[PDB]
């Protein structure tokens, strides 16, 4: 699962950021940061679904969790 983002995907994300040379331990460290980031966002997203009494997390719940996490996102709702 977590190893589904590896080798060129971690390389492509670096190129868009402007990185030239990538050390070997970046890939594992990148997964850990992405893991913690996803854990935080999904937690607040799931919390809204728990209050709304739903078994399906809507696009709003993702947006609203990002808004509370200081990661405002345009495009997937009002």
């Amino acid at each position: 699962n977590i190893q589904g983002i590896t080798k060129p995907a971690i390389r492509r994300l670096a190129r868009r950021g402007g990185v030239k040379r990538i050390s070997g331990l970046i890939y594992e460290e990148t997964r850990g940061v992405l893991k913690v980031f996803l854990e935080n966002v999904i937690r607040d997203a799931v919390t809204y679904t728990e209050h709304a009494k739903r078994k399906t997390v809507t696009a709003m719940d993702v947006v609203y969790a990002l808004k509370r996490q200081g990661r405002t996102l345009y495009g997937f709702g009002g």
Partner: protein, 46 residues
């Protein structure tokens, strides 16, 4: 000719392509900074 020179013999006349490391990397930087397509795969992310 010089065959007769017995002393002070006159010696004048006779005897694939590879690119350098870092170039493709920078070119990738230019390629993805211009586009906005998603970089992580969709199904492994899901």
């Amino acid at each position: 000719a010089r065959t007769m020179q017995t002393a002070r013999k006159s010696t004048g006349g006779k005897a694939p392509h590879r690119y350098r490391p870092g170039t493709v990397a920078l070119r990738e930087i230019r390629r993805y900074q211009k586009s906005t397509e998603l970089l992580i795969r969709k199904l492994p992310f899901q």
